[PDB]
Amino acid sequence: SPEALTTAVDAAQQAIALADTLDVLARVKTEHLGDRSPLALARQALAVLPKEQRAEAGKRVNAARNAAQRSYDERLATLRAERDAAVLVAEGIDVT
Amino acid sequence: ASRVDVTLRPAQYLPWHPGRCAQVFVGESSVGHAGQLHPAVIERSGLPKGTCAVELNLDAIPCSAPLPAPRVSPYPAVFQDVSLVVAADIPAQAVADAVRAGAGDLLEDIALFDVFTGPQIGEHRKSLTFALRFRAPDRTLTEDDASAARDAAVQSAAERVGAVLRG
Amino acid sequence: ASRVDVTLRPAQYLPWHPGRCAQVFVGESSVGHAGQLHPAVIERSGLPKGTCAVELNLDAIPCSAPLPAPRVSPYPAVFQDVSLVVAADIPAQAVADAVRAGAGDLLEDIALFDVFTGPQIGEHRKSLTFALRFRAPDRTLTEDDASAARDAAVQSAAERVGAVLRG
RNA sequence: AGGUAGCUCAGUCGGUAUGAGCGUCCGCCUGAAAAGCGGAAGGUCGGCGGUUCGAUCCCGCCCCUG
């Protein structure tokens, strides 16, 4: 259902920002962006509808899917940056 | 091999690991760096994990022609150990320098052989234990005279790096 | 430092420990001894316990002027380990020589890294495990061709020191 | 003519990459190994841009080898 996708983006962008662990975010991904995700089921249903309803219904699906991707990508890079930074601190030694 | 004294100091300088990198000084002149390479550099470069590296500028190391004239004392030595608690980020070389500065001329050798952390010590702290060898040049050093030099070494460590004698 | 190959063989020669003494040979010529000193010699002499010693005759070591011309194969290597049970008094160098003699030219490196005794092996026995690195000079060696060289190495160890492949 | 997982390759004709061997990492096995089986992780599909609601797939240019 087009324009009803805004409830799936809000449910994803808040579940993505809530994850503070790479393992938690890995499960949040497949639930909201995986092959079985509702946002993925909206893209698979773009070749069965007629041609006249394909240029506009897909623009609302691609906009709702790219909005959730950016929230995931920016959250994945953030959590991986914090992980990498913590390794450098934990690996500190007395060089003298 | 160059017959020069060198100090190693904490530093951050790519491609070395910011927590496992030392800058090498001869006197107050920097001559290079050493330590483990940055894990991100290692990953992007396809290098083995944990690869380490060192680079020095030989032309910055002045050629030394020392003519030692050592005087060896044959008198017996006194062996004593001291255990000092400092903040965890106090470099071990600074604690030893402070001990050496307080011990005076009677101190012949100092060697760190234990670095301990745990609930016995407390958080943000670490315990260091040094083996001290005292020796007089003209007499058999007494246990008390050595302890006076040890007490002065402990007092010096307390003033310079905040070392607390362990109890 | 002398650029000579040396073999060490069990020997009994005072003041060395009869069970921890090696005689040193260059070819078939004896050049000296090494190992731990006899505990009775150490006791009577007031020496530190466990004192070790070595003495070689330099004039018996012929001066060598080798001109190496190595050929380095760039082709990939095959890594395989072999575990061999021998009698406990079979010297480990004899087992390695037998493995090397059976492996042939494909064997680039052999390294002993485990010496094991226990009820799994049996009394009067010991198990030795070697790391083998095979490499061909003109082709990428296959896993099978390396195993054929390994099987021949195991057969050679069986015939010369009675080594039994561990199972 | 091809470029696709770290490697070697099969394959996908605009709206789901799907994979196979090696390698790697685990599990069984060994006191520990190797070798074995067994499981698994593992992919802006050569780069920059058109076109398109959407490009590994079509168009332009460029990089790479035969």
Side-chain angles (χ1 to χ4, degrees):
Chain A
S1 299
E3 282 304 324
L5 315 164
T6 186
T7 63
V9 178
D10 296 354
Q13 288 182 324
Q14 289 193 352
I16 286 177
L18 215 65
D20 47 357
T21 298
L22 289 181
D23 297 323
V24 179
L25 185 56
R27 273 179 284 98
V28 171
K29 175 193 180 181
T30 58
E31 294 169 16
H32 299 72
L33 290 87
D35 191 70
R36 207 178 178 180
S37 163
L39 287 175
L41 298 178
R43 188 196 186 187
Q44 301 174 3
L46 292 176
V48 188
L49 42 78
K51 53 187 177 183
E52 69 277 5
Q53 303 172 344
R54 199 173 297 185
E56 295 299 329
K59 194 177 63 177
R60 294 183 292 269
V61 170
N62 292 333
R65 197 195 184 198
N66 291 336
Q69 269 284 346
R70 279 294 161 262
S71 296
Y72 167 79
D73 296 355
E74 295 178 0
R75 190 62 181 171
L76 176 62
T78 295
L79 292 178
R80 290 199 288 202
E82 298 177 354
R83 170 202 64 186
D84 299 342
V87 174
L88 302 183
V89 175
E91 287 178 352
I93 62 185
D94 181 358
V95 304
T96 78
Chain B
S2 305
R3 306 212 297 271
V4 295
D5 294 337
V6 146
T7 53
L8 282 73
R9 307 177 187 175
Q12 291 78 56
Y13 188 62
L14 288 172
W16 282 274
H17 188 301
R20 301 183 176 184
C21 172
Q23 189 171 8
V24 181
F25 289 80
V26 177
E28 289 305 319
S29 296
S30 169
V31 301
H33 297 82
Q36 181 180 332
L37 295 185
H38 198 295
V41 170
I42 289 175
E43 221 283 342
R44 293 191 298 264
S45 302
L47 298 166
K49 291 194 175 176
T51 298
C52 292
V54 38
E55 182 164 24
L56 313 181
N57 177 12
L58 277 188
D59 293 358
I61 307 178
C63 274
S64 62
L67 301 177
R71 292 174 177 181
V72 180
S73 175
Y75 292 90
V78 182
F79 298 83
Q80 291 184 356
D81 299 351
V82 57
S83 197
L84 299 172
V85 176
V86 296
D89 52 9
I90 296 296
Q93 184 59 53
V95 183
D97 292 340
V99 168
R100 183 192 306 274
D105 295 320
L106 292 182
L107 185 70
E108 169 170 296
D109 187 80
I110 169 177
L112 173 76
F113 67 91
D114 187 63
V115 183
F116 182 73
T117 64
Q120 307 90 338
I121 307 307
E123 291 186 6
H124 316 291
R125 294 168 176 85
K126 66 183 171 183
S127 182
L128 314 172
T129 307
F130 298 89
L132 307 181
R133 187 167 75 242
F134 300 95
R135 198 192 301 266
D138 56 356
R139 71 194 186 276
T140 305
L141 199 64
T142 69
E143 193 79 62
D144 287 354
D145 288 70
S147 297
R150 172 181 53 85
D151 292 335
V154 171
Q155 177 66 25
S156 177
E159 298 163 351
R160 293 154 180 252
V161 298
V164 181
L165 195 60
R166 192 171 168 192
Chain C
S2 305
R3 306 212 297 271
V4 295
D5 294 337
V6 146
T7 53
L8 282 73
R9 307 177 187 175
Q12 291 78 56
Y13 188 62
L14 288 172
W16 282 274
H17 188 301
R20 301 183 176 184
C21 172
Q23 189 171 8
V24 181
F25 289 80
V26 177
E28 289 305 319
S29 296
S30 169
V31 301
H33 297 82
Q36 181 180 332
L37 295 185
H38 198 295
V41 170
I42 289 175
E43 221 283 342
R44 293 191 298 264
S45 302
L47 298 166
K49 291 194 175 176
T51 298
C52 292
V54 38
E55 182 164 24
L56 313 181
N57 177 12
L58 277 188
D59 293 358
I61 307 178
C63 274
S64 62
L67 301 177
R71 292 174 177 181
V72 180
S73 175
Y75 292 90
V78 182
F79 298 83
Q80 291 184 356
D81 299 351
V82 57
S83 197
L84 299 172
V85 176
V86 296
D89 52 9
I90 296 296
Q93 184 59 53
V95 183
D97 292 340
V99 168
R100 183 192 306 274
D105 295 320
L106 292 182
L107 185 70
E108 169 170 296
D109 187 80
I110 169 177
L112 173 76
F113 67 91
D114 187 63
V115 183
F116 182 73
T117 64
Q120 307 90 338
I121 307 307
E123 291 186 6
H124 316 291
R125 294 168 176 85
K126 66 183 171 183
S127 182
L128 314 172
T129 307
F130 298 89
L132 307 181
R133 187 167 75 242
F134 300 95
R135 198 192 301 266
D138 56 356
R139 71 194 186 276
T140 305
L141 199 64
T142 69
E143 193 79 62
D144 287 354
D145 288 70
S147 297
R150 172 181 53 85
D151 292 335
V154 171
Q155 177 66 25
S156 177
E159 298 163 351
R160 293 154 180 252
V161 298
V164 181
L165 195 60
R166 192 171 168 192

